[PDB]
Design a protein around this ligand. Structure first.
Ligand SMILES: Nc1nc2c(ncn2[C@@H]2O[C@H](COP(=O)(O)OP(=O)(O)OP(=O)(O)O)[C@@H](O)[C@H]2O)c(=O)[nH]1
Ligand SMILES: Nc1nc2c(ncn2[C@@H]2O[C@H](COP(=O)(O)OP(=O)(O)OP(=O)(O)O)[C@@H](O)[C@H]2O)c(=O)[nH]1
Ligand SMILES: [Mg+2]
Ligand SMILES: [Mg+2]
Lengths: 548, 548
């Protein structure tokens, strides 16, 4: 028929190598990308078997009909025995007549070409890969421009910071895949709610940035409260399970030519934080005095609260085990230390009820110094018993305020001399987020501590070319997979794949891998098969009191 | 016909959204990816015009028939007026009957899906994006494994470092595109030359790594000299123009369980460097004494050579102008300082004849201290004339040895007090390579110097998600496009695109862009249209004597 002409132009427009072959291997179709990949033209390869022209090997075939579908991409090579190797990502699907398997369709994507996608790189550098919206880079650029521009700067602009409430709930409850969907759904609503000219970005985490150029004060607040309402009305559900999605909005009225970029960003931050501190699901319009006096008050309140607790011995330490998944590995006892705070009545205070405030008001060095001192102190008390399970690894999480703290090493040195805890026994922890936020200091800190003889771990680790590049510079011993990826590993094929990639590249880069949120033995066995070195979760052991 | 069944399964296996429409817009085909992208099924969209179902807008159509082909990818959005926006990279080709334009074929790739390609990320993290071979990460991993492995460690291994000779020649002569082809061609020969089990990687630049596990000493050297010969016999040509490709090989015989990874890498480096220092196109087998005594001798030779030159006033400084491309921009005179060395006879010494040796033997701090001192000294002498063209920017290149030098800032402070040159007038330069090689120190150095009031530039800048991520951490004022990209900008569509992306993302990140190797006004006008802030090259001004 004349359909061949239509299909051939479509098949030739596709940049990916398309190969169609009969059930027995004989070639039926090769598009120009397949021809260039295999070094064989269709006219010289038609009817001839696949294996006799080129090889689709691995790194040292009929499986497609069985189980190796086109759902997932498979890393193969194209060994052509002339011009040799071409690295691909294969996808295969059977060809049917109607319950009669007649052939095979192969979609082959050339890994060498990825470097040539200039529009893709450019897009990526200015947009969030998940949500599709502009990123922090592009947003801050557009915000700066709105203020510095010579033209079209007649009226005032409106900066908004919209942060999702209890977004960690969604991730720790269902997993990372669920949280990504919610983010994508939150994205579509804020898209529908804004007009052309308005700039909407994901600034990181569950935080979005909205810019309304040349829009009045009353109009600006009206839009914010409406967007707040539309997210409140979002009936988000994950595999039946419904979630109450809510947002905390921080609004700032801007002036082009007067108000600086860093002043604008910081003002929207205090207002967003204040809407949270004021109970969540609220819009907090920044006022230079009215919404600033509460920051001075909040600092005073928390200085008193953190110091009282410390003085009143209400902070305590818990220990959760980390165990080797490797068959034959014994080692010393590995525990991760976790902080707990009890109020004046004597009941446990949730983490979000004081860590965000202590972090905001620079009270984290205090707590980290108390944690480290009382961990070493406990280890001495625990050692008084000879029968006691000796701790080979005691992991402690440090904040960004500590990573940057010049006086921490002298304090740690002093602590070592006082409690005689071997440095080797201690494993300091920093999140991927905290490390990158203070990159030059993190590198400097990790190396100084490693010289002392301490180990280091990188927490809440995501996979990407960025995170793996940051990993080259961060000399940590362990890599800890974010729990959200482990939570639905066995239910979501991308989260399972994420775990596998974090593991492989983590092993490639000389790191030992740890999986958190291993709540069942099914998850434990899955991680063991993959190759994960350590497991932590409710299937391993629950957090138990450590300190007295 | 029954061809529809064959084509539909192929079209459904493609992950990219395929849209086929008539010349007048009416839809003919949508694959499941196109249906999911546009929110419209083919059964409910067949015959109906494109524009009336969804919109393929931009960020604020018939052009395809004219000029906007499927050769280059175009960044568009898919505004569907229901579930709103989907960010794509469009490619379009006309549909013919035979010189009769009947319709249009659109290949739409969803930018949101890029995050889900796990096999692609994993491949990327373990392989060079250009050459397709394993990267430094994977190679060092495999090398470590060869040494640390409990099993299959019977015999000895062979580490090889193959570095292309005068590879900068190919790039500065033809451009980056030519050099990439040569690298890809060098890759295919080393592929054909090695057997299954042998590990071949691009370790960076024009340097390749080869590992021959459980291969005798005599066999190991035999393979190296053969590979050296096959590259010598490579008749490389770029658009008619032939190039004599040659390689300098450094070989090390390894022992699993004794010889460490860093000892192995360093030994292959000294042997490769020695084959270069010994005249290039040679294989230098590392010998612990015989090929180590020459490193002590070479250090002695160069300490004497660099100090003599300094003592004998044979080092001089040249100045090359940098000019604004922006229409209306005047500014002060911008010059880039370049070092030159004259031998004992009085004739100019090529850069490769002393900078590789001075860099190898730690003599770069010396030269950088002489350059900076004599630049400030010249600026005072030049200022004695009131008529003199005042220099608003004087750019000086600093080495990795300087970026890491703790005593440089006190020396610079002293120089400032002695020659009273305004810090603002000085622009320090570091290559992307040097910055990343010493990342924590570069960041620390750039910020300390910026506080003094100096400007900073990032040289030989490549584009990628890695380089743009490194750029977030490096607070430089200017970004300098690598000349190799500018050389064939007007002849190669990818190098033109590279220039455009380096520019856009450089402007996004608050940097001012500079293009080097602007040898013609055609290149100058091209860069001006793109948006480049500054131009440097033989169309602007040639390097002229600066120092006396
Ligand atoms: N699924 C997913 N989760 C992410 C992503 N980026 C960050 N997160 C998670 O988002 C959460 C952000 O937590 P927070 O905003 O600090 O805390 P919260 O639970 O929302 O509580 P509030 O203080 O009320 O904001 C963490 O659990 C992160 O691991 C992403 O791209 N995808
Ligand atoms: N086209 C291209 N050029 C690259 C790439 N990576 C690095 N280069 C260039 O490769 C060159 C490496 O130069 P060198 O090896 O130090 O110098 P050389 O000219 O080969 O001289 P020798 O000292 O004999 O090795 C520089 O011009 C780099 O800019 C790449 O991926 N593609
Ligand atoms: Mg939140
Ligand atoms: Mg070279």
């Amino acid at each position: 028929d004349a359909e061949r002409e239509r299909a051939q132009i479509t098949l030739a427009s596709i940049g990916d190598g398309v190969i169609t072959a009969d059930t027995q291997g004989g070639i039926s179709y090769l598009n120009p990308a397949a021809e260039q990949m295999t070094n064989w033209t269709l006219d010289k390869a038609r009817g001839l078997p696949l294996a006799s022209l080129f090889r689709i090997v691995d790194e040292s075939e009929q499986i497609l009909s069985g189980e190796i579908d086109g759902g997932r991409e498979h890393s193969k090579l194209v060994l052509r025995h002339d011009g040799s190797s071409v690295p691909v990502t294969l996808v295969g699907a059977p060809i049917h007549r109607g319950a009669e398997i007649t052939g095979v369709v192969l979609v082959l994507h050339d890994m060498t070409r990825e470097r040539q996608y200039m529009a893709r790189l450019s897009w990526q550098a200015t947009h969030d890969a998940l949500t599709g919206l502009t990123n922090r880079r592009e947003f801050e650029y557009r915000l700066q421009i709105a203020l510095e521009r010579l033209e079209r700067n007649s009226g005032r602009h409106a900066l908004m910071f919209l942060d999702l409430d209890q977004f960690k709930l969604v991730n720790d409850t269902c997993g990372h895949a669920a949280g990504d969907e919610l983010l994508r759904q939150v994205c579509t609503l804020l898209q529908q709610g804004l007009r052309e000219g308005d700039t909407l970005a994901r600034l990181g985490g569950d935080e979005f940035g909205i810019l309304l150029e040349n829009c009045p004060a009353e109009k600006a607040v009206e839009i914010a409260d409406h967007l707040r309402k539309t997210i409140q009305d979002l009936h988000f559900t994950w595999s039946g399970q419904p979630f109450n999605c809510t947002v905390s909005v921080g609004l700032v009225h801007l002036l082009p030519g007067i108000s600086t970029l860093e002043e604008a960003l910081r003002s929207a931050d205090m207002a967003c934080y204040m809407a949270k501190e004021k109970g969540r699901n609220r819009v907090q319009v920044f006022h230079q005095d009215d919404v600033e006096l509460s920051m001075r008050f909040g600092e005073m309140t928390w200085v008193q609260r953190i110091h009282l607790a410390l003085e009143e011995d209400r902070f305590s330490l818990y220990a959760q085990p980390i165990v080797p998944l490797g068959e034959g590995a014994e080692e010393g006892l590995h525990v991760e230390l976790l902080l707990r705070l009890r109020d004046e009545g004597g009941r446990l205070v949730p983490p979000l009820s004081f860590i965000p405030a202590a972090e905001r008001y620079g009270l984290m060095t205090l707590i980290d110094r108390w944690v480290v001192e009382n961990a070493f102190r406990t280890l001495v008390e625990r050692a008084q018993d000879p029968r006691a399970e000796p701790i080979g690894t005691c992991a402690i999480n440090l904040s960004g305020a500590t990573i940057g703290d010049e006086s921490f090493l002298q304090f740690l040195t002093e602590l070592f001399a006082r409690y005689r805890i071997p440095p080797q026994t201690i494993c300091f922890e920093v999140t991927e987020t905290v490390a990158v936020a203070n990159l030059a200091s993190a590198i400097r800190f990790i190396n100084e501590l490693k010289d002392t003889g301490c180990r280091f771990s990188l927490d809440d680790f995501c996979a990407g070319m960025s995170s793996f590049i940051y990993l080259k510079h961060l000399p940590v011993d362990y890599l800890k997979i974010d729990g959200s990826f482990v939570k639905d590993m066995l239910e979501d094929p991308i989260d399972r794949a994420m775990v596998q990639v974090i593991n492989h590249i983590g092993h490639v880069m000389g790191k030992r891998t740890i999986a958190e949120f291993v709540e069942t033995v099914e998850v434990m066995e899955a991680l063991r098969e993959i190759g994960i070195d350590y497991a932590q979760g409710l299937a391993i052991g629950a957090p138990l009191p450590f300190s007295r």
